[PDB]
Amino acid sequence: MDVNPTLLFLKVPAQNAISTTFPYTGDPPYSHGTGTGYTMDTVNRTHQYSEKGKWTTNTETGAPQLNPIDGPLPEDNEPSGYAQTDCVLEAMAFLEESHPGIFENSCLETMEVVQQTRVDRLTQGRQTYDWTLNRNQPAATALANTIEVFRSNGLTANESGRLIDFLKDVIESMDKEEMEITTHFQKKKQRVNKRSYLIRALTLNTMTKDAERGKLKRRAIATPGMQIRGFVYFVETLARSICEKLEQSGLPVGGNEKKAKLANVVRKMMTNSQDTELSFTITGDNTKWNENQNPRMFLAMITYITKNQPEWFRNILSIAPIMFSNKMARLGKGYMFESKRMKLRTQIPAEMLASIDLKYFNESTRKKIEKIRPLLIDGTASLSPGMMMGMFNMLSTVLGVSILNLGQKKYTKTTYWWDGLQSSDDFALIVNAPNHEGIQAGVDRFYRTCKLVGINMSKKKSYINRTGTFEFTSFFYRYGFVANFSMELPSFGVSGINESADMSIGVTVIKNNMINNDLGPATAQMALQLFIKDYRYTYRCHRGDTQIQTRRSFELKKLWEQTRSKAGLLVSDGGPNLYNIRNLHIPEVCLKWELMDEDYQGRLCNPLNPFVSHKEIESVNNAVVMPGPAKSMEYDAVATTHSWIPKRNRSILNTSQRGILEDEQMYQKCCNLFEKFFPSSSYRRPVGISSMVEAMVSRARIDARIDFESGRIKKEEFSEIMKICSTIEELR
Amino acid sequence: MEDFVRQCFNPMIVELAEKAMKEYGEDLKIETNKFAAICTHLEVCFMYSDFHFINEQGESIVVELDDPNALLKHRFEIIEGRDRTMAWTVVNSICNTTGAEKPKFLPDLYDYKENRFIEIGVTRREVHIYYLEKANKIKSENTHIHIFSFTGEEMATKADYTLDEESRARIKTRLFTIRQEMANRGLWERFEITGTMRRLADQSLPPNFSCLENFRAYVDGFEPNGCIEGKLSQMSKEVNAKIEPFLKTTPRPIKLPDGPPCFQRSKFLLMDALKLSIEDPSHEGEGIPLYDAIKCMRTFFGWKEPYIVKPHERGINSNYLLSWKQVLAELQDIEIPRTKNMKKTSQLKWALGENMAPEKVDFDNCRDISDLKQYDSDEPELRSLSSWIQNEFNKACELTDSIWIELDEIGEDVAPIEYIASMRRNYFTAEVSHCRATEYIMKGVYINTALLNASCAAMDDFQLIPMISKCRTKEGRRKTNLYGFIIKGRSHLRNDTDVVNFVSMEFSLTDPRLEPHKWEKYCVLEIGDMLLMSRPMFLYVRTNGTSKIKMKWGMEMRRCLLQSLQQIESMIEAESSVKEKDMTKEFFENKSETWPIGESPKGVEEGSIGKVCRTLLAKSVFNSLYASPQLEGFSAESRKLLLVVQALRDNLEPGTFDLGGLYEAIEECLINDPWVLLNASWFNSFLTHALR
Amino acid sequence: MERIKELRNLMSQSRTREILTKTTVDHMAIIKKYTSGRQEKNPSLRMKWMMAMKYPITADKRITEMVPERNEQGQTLWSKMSDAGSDRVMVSPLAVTWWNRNGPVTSTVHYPKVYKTYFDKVERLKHGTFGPVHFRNQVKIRRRVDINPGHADLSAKEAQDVIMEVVFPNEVGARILTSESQLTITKEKKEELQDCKISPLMVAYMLERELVRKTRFLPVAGGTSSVYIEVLHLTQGTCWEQMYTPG
RNA sequence: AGUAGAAACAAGGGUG
RNA sequence: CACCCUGCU
C-alpha cells in the first residue's frame, strides 16, 4: 500500500490543507559568488524591451539614452515598454474626479513635514553606496563622509543644521569642476573633474538576491546612493500621502487591514443580488513590473499631481525623477577563472571585462558581453529606461489603482464595470456582468488600457474563477479567510539576540500566532516545549539536576547547590520553566519574583554589573527579527545581567582601512564625555551651535557654583574648577 | 560706518552680539542703523555686569578691582550672549534651587542678594511708553525689573532696591559717549535650479518637447479629451486577453526528463543502518561519547580483515580500505579524552582533500596560460526515476518498537481549557512518538550539533565523532544505540556557504549488488559478519560535504513536528465545532473517519488518524533532508494547478489563459533530485486519479 | 570633580582637540553612530557560531577589579583582548553565572515601582475569575482597540514633556505644565522616584510606556475592555470561549 | 575526487 | 620557510 500524501486532497479542500504544501522546513538557496551576469542580463532585457524607442545621448555625460515613449503600439502578447503619456495623465485626472481634494491634501501635509524634517533622521535606514569610498557603507558612515568631503572644498550652506539645505548643497555640488577626494591608504588625496563627478554621483550598485524562496533562478537587487535618499524621502512622503486613503490601495498598508479590506470588497460584489449578473474574480500577477515603468512617466505624473502649489515644493519634488532617469549601474564583481586544470585560480577586473574579449568565458556570456558593450562608459552601464528592484514602492501602485478606477459604470460607457484590489505585486480583479461576452469584453478592455500604461498582466500566472474561493499575496480565501501555519515557521526559534531579549520574543511570537493565525492551545504547549529545549541547548543552561557536561557546568552546579527554593532560579540560570497560556503574557522575572531569594535578586538585578549596555532610546527592548523586508519587533522583560552584547567582526584589521577603527575610538571617547553632562541626551538629540566643549565647561561652572550654595562641598573645589576652566580655555 | 561694529567696540561684544544676531535673512549690512543699537544693548548690559561682586559676608560693596583676585564671586548671573538650551538650563537650575519663579520670556540676570531676578532694556523709547510696552510683555509675574535710560531714569519695584550709584554713573557715561557724537551720518524658501542640472533635466523630456518649462505649461492645461477610447480603437486587435476553458477531464501529464537513474544523496543512511545496542542508564546527553562507542563496538564477534566489495569508479579506492584500517587502531589507543584528533595519514588526506585548491595567483602575470577560461557555468546533467523512494516512504511511516522523544514538562495548569489541550497533546504525542521519522530527526540533530560544535572549536584537526542515540522501550529500561562513525576535515569557513569535507562510515546489512545505481558514490567495504543464520555485515563508506547554512538548518529539525499537529488539530477544530461536545476523543480513538492517503492496485486505500499523523511527519522530514532549489520551484508552480483543479472539482467554472506555459514552468524544475521527481510523479498520478 | 580633569586629559591631544573644536552640537548626532560594521542579517546563524567559541560576549572594564580573571576551578573568565571599534573587554558566558552566587548585593525592593506596568499584570492574574468552557462558532470582527490597562490618555509629546520635566529637571526648557491632574501626577512621581538607584533611560522608558495610549487593528469578538484585550489567549480562541474576567 | 550548481567551495593577504 | 593576525568587510 504505497503511500501518497497528495491523495489527501480527495477529501480535504485544497484551501483547507494548503499548509501542507510549503517546503518551508528546509533551507533557502543562496548565491555562490558574483552576480554581474544577472546585471547585464537585465540591462539587455530592458534595452530590447524598448527597442523601437528612440536612441539618444547626453551633452553633459555620455552614457547612451533610450526613450520608450509611446512610439509604435504593441502587436502581440509580448512584454513591452510603451506606456502612454495621455493615458497616465487622464488616468489620474479621473482619479481626482473620483475623490476630490486628495492631491491637495497630500501637497499640504507633505509640504509641512518637508519644512519640518531634519538631516539627522537619515541616520536610520539600510546599507548604502558611498561615492567617496566606492563601496557599500552603512548609513551614518556614508552620511559623515559626504558631509566631510563637502566641507573640505568650497561649500557654505550645510552648516544650517537642517535637511532641505543639505539637499540644496547636494544640488550645488554638480556645478564645480575640481572636486577633491580623500583616500585612506595606509591619507592621500585625489582630484575628480566635472565629468567624472557627475558620472560618479548617479551610480546605484548591484548585488545578488539572497535567501528568498519561491523561485528557481536567482535575481539581482540594486542599492541607491546616499546622495539621493533625501529626494527619495520627499517623493516617498508625497506618494504615501496620496495613497494612505484609497480603498483599492495597499501600499501605505498594515496587516489584518488587508484582510478586512478585501473582505468588505468581496461582500458588496458577493452581495450583488443573485438576480441577473454572474461574476468572476481574476487572480493576476504582473510580470516584469519594474522593467516597463519609466522615469519620464513618473515625472509627468509629478508634473500633474502637484499642480497649483508653491514652486519651491514642485521643483524640490520633481528633481528626484530627473536624477533617476540618467542613471548608471555598476557591472559587478568579475569572474574567478581556473585558467587551467593545474593549480591556477585568479580574479579578473570588472573593468577589464569591458576591456577583454571574454571569449574564454562561455559563448552565451560572450553574447551578453557583445550586446552590453555599447552601454558601458566608465565601469558602469547606462540604464536610461526601466528601474531595478527595490527603489520605489508607491507610485507604481498609484498607477495600478488608477487603471483599476478607470473601470466604473461611469466612464466605461457600457454594461461592464471591473474593479478590485491592487497590492504592489498582485491584482485581484473582480468583474461584474450579466453576460459571458460581457466578461470577455471587460477583461479585454482592462488588458488593453493596461498595456496602454505599461502594466502587463502575466497570462502564465493569472487565472479566472467564479467568486467564492480565490487567493492573492499568499493569503488564501474560501468564502472567507483561513489559516496557514507555514509561513511563520521560520520565525519560530531562538531569535539570536541575547538571552533575556529572546526568552521574551519567543513567547511573544507564540502569542501573536495564537491570537491571529489559528494556533490552538495544544500546539501552544508544543511550541513552548520545543522553544525551551532549543534555547537550553544553544545557551548551555541545562537544568540543575542534569549531569550533562558543558563549559558552564560547574558554575551552574554551584548556583544550584545553595538555594532554598530553586523555582526562583531563572530559566537561563538553571530554573524550571513555568510558562503556560495563562502565564504567557508576563515576562519571566515579573512572574517568579515572589519565589526568588533576596541576595540572588541583589546580584541579578543590580545596575552595578558591567554586562549591560544601553544605547539611544530608539533601540530599547526592541529587536529586528528575521522574517518581506525586516520590521522592528518589540518585547518586554526585566532588564538584568543577561542582556549582553556579543562581539563584532575583527576583519578590518588585516586590511588597509584599519585606521577608520581608530577614528571611531576617538569619536566615541569624545562622545561619552559629552554624555556625562546631560543624561537628558537619551530622550532628545540636543540642538545647538557651539564647539561641543562650551557646553561642558559652561555647565561645569554653573553646576559647581550651584552645589556649593546648598549642598556640602568645600570651596577649594570651587577655586580649582575655576582655574581648570582657565586651563581648558588657554589653548585655542 | 559699514563696519562700525568691528571698528570701535570691543571684539568680545562684536562676536557675542553677532552670534545672537545672524539667525535670519538679516545680513551683515541691512538698514544700517539698527546693528549699532543691538550691540549697544549688549555693551550696556555687559558693562552693568561689571564692578559688583559678592562677599561671603553677603554685603554690597563697590569693588574697584572689576575682577576678583581670589576666593570670591561676582554679583551678577549673566544670561545674555549664552546658548538657547543653556539659557533654560541655567534658569531652571535657578528655579528648582532656593528661590526663583518660572519666567516666560528671555530675561537677562540674577542676584543672590535676597533671591531676586533682574531684567533690563534700553532703546530710544523715552520712559513709560517703553516701560509700559515692557509691562505688557512681562506683567504676569512679580520680578525685579531695574530699567535704565539715557539721562538719569531708573525705577525699581515700588522703587525698593539696594545698590550703589557709581555704577549707574558709569552707565550714564556710556550712554553719554554713544550718542555717536551727534551721529555725523545724521540719523535719529526659494529653490531654483542652476545651469548644468537644468540642462540634464531638459534632456529628460518626451520626444516632442524641448524645455521643462513648456512641459509644465502643457501639463497645466489638461482635461480628458479622449485617450483610452480612441487609442483602444486604434490599437490592433491581436493584443488581447483571450479566455480559454478548463473542462472535466484533467489534462495531460508533466513529462519527466530522460537519462540515467537517481542515487541516494542523503548526508547519512536512511533504511540501511544497523544499531549496536548497549543496556545503559545513560540519559539523553549523558555518558562519554567515545566511551559508549567503545562499549558498543566491544560486543560484536565476527570482524575479519576488510576487502573491497564494490569499488568507487572514480577514486583510489584502496585508500578507503586504509581509512577504516586506521580506525580500530586509534580505538585501541584509548583502552576517555572526550575528543580525539587523528594523525595525518595520507589515506585520510586524499579522502578529505588538502592542497586540491588552485593557488589564487595574480591574473595579470598569468594571462599567457593556454587554458585561461571561466569555469562551469553550465547546467546539471539530467536523470530519471528509480523505485527505492517509495519503499523508503513506506518504511518511514511504520511504527517502531521504541519511544524516541522524551519531553520537558511545563508549569501546572488550573484553567479547564488547559486541561483539554493537555489531554489532546497526550494522544498526539503517543501516536507520533514511535516512528522512524522521529529516529531521523533525533539522529539528525545529534549529528549536526556535534558537527558544528567541533568544527567551531578545532580548525585544523581531523576530529572523529561516533553517532550514538538514546531511546527507551515499553518495558522501561533504556538502551543506547551505535550507528557508525564520522571523521571531519579542516574547517576554515569564511563565507556562509563554504564547505567542510567529512568522511562517513555506516553499518549496513544490505548487499549492494541488488541495487548498484543508488550507491554510485558509496564504497561498500565488507568488514565483519553476523550470526543468527549468517549474514554479511557491510560498512558503507563515502566522502561528502556540508556547509554552514545546511548545518544550521539541520540544528533545528523538530520544527517539522510543528507542521504536523497544526494540520491534525485543525481537522479536529472544524469537526468539534459542530457536535457541541468534546469531540477529539472520538476522533483519535475508535475513530472510523478515514482519509485517502495513497494509491494501490486495489484502488485508493484509506487510513486511520495515526496513519495520517505519521504520513504528515514524513513529508516534513524529507523537505529538509533532501532540501533543494528544484523542490521550491516545483511546489510554487504546482500549487497553482492544484488550486485550479480544486476550483473545478466543485463547480466554480474555472478558465485559464495559458496552460502550456504553466506546464513548461512545472517541467523546467525537474532535473535530478529524487525528491522533486517523486513529487512530480505523485502529482501526475493524482491528477489522473482525480479527473473531477 | 574628576570629570573636568578627564576633559583636559582628552583635550591635550592633537586629534581630540581638532575634533572637539570643530564638532558643532548637531554633528554630535552623526558622531554617535559612525561605524564600519553593519547589522547581523542572519541573527540565528551567527549566534550558533558564537556560542561555541570561548570569548563571545562583551563587557566593560570594571570586571577585573570586580570579577577574578581566574576561576575557582581555573576556567578563564575574561581576557586581555580589547574589542574592535570599542575599548571594552571580551568575556565568556561563564563569568555571568559566577556573578550569580559571588556578586555584589544591593537593594531592589524599591524595584517593582519602576516596572509598575508589569507587576500590575501578575497581581491581577492572581485574583482572576474562573468559568466554564463553551464550544460554538465565534463571530469575529477586525477593529481597532487599545491594550494598556489604564493610563493618562495624554498625547505622546504631552507625556514626553512631562517625562523630560520630571526625570531631567535641570534640562526642561521653557515649556510649562498646564493641567492640574497631570500636575498632581508629576508631583507624586517626583516624590516616588527619590532614593532609587536605577537606570535613567530604563525608568523613563517604563513611565513613557505607562503613559501614552496605543491602539491596534485586532480581530475582536465582543467587549473591547483593555484589561480584557490583555488575555485574548485564554478568553476566546478559534472555536471556543472560556469564562474569565480580569482582576 | 567530493560539494554543488548558470557560479563557486576543496583556507587567503603579512613578514625571512 | 619558520611563525601568527581572521571566520558576515
Author numbering:
A (entry chain B): 1 to 186, 207 to 647, 650 to 754
B (entry chain A): 1 to 188, 203 to 349, 354 to 550, 557 to 716
C (entry chain C): 1 to 247
Provide excerpts from the study.
Influenza virus ribonucleoprotein complexes (RNPs), composed of the polymerase complex (FluPol), nucleoprotein (NP), and RNA, are essential for replication and transcription. In the life cycle of the influenza virus, the viral genome RNA (vRNA) or the positive-sense complementary RNA (cRNA) segments are encapsidated by a virus-encoded nucleoprotein (NP), with their 5′ and 3′ termini clamped by the polymerase complex (FluPol; composed of PA, PB1, and PB2), thus forming the ribonucleoprotein complexes (RNPs). In State-In, interfaces for FluPol dimerization or Pol II interaction are blocked, but fully exposed in State-Out. These structures reveal detailed FluPol–NP–RNA coupling and suggest a conformational shift in RNPs during the viral life cycle.
The relative flexibility of the RNP components limits further improvement of the quality of the cryo-EM densities. Focused and masked refinements were required to attain the reconstructions of FluPol:NP-0:NP+1:NP+2:RNA unit, NP-0:RNA unit, and NP+1:NP+2:RNA unit (the positions for NP-0, NP+1, NP+2, NP+3, NP+4, NP-1, NP-2, and NP-3 are defined in Fig. 1) from State-In mini-vRNP at 2.97-Å, 4.75-Å, and 4.52-Å resolution, and the reconstructions of FluPol:NP-0:RNA unit and FluPol unit from State-Out mini-vRNP at 3.83-Å and 3.62-Å resolution. In contrast, the FluPol:NP-0:RNA unit in State-Out, as a rigid body, has a ~90° rotation compared to its position in State-In, thus resulting in FluPol attaching at the outer rim of the NP-RNA ring. In both states, the relative orientation of FluPol, NP-0, and RNA is conserved. The structures of FluPol in State-In and State-Out share high similarities with an r.m.s.d of 0.723 Å for all the visible Cɑ atoms. In both states, PA, PB1, and the first 250 residues of PB2 have unambiguous densities, whereas the densities corresponding to the C-terminal part of PB2 (residue 251 to the C-terminus) are only partially visible, indicating the C-terminal part of PB2 may be flexible relative to the other FluPol components. The interactions of the vRNA 5′ and 3′ termini with FluPol in the State-In and State-Out structures are generally similar to those observed in previous structures. The first ten nucleotides of the 5′ end of the vRNA (rA+1 to rA+10) form a compact stem-loop fold that is inserted into a deep pocket at the interface of the PB1 fingers and the PA CTD. Nine nucleotides of the 3′ end of vRNA (rU+239 to rC+247) bind nearby in a region that includes residues from all three polymerase subunits.
